[PDB]
Amino acid sequence: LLGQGDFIRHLMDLLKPELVRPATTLYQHNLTGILETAVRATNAQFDSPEILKRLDVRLLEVSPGDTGWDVFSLDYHVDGPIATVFTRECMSHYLRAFNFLWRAKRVEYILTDI
């Protein structure tokens, strides 16, 4: 839900350097490694390893006409009963909310960077 925001800031510094690139550079193994490194560096290292295994990354749509800040998206692997406690419509609503939040966060980080 974009809570602890230090990881968000660090990931912004790491990804905006890469989100300037186009969607044709869709190599998110580096993105996942960056997620792991951010967890190991920012205060989210205390997050449970299972919480990190629920965490994931999935780019919503492909758009080379949009930088990484417009095609990049995250993913949340829910497990078992918790996955049965996350509806697909609920998942879509949460995805839309996270998209709006990420757009706002991109705007805010852009302002800070400017």
112 scored as a contact of another protein (CB under 8 A): yes
Chain position carrying tokens 């009963």: 81
Name the residue nearer to another protein (CB basis): 89 or 113: 113
End-to-end CA distance of the chain: 25
101 scored as a contact of another protein (CB under 8 A): no
Name the residue nearer to another protein (CB basis): 37 or 87: 37
9 scored as a contact of another protein (CB under 8 A): yes
The SS3 call for residue 1 is coil
**What is the DSSP track for 56-76?**
EE------TTS-HHHH--EEE
Q: Which of 21, 28, 63, 98 binds another protein (CB under 8 A)?
A: 28
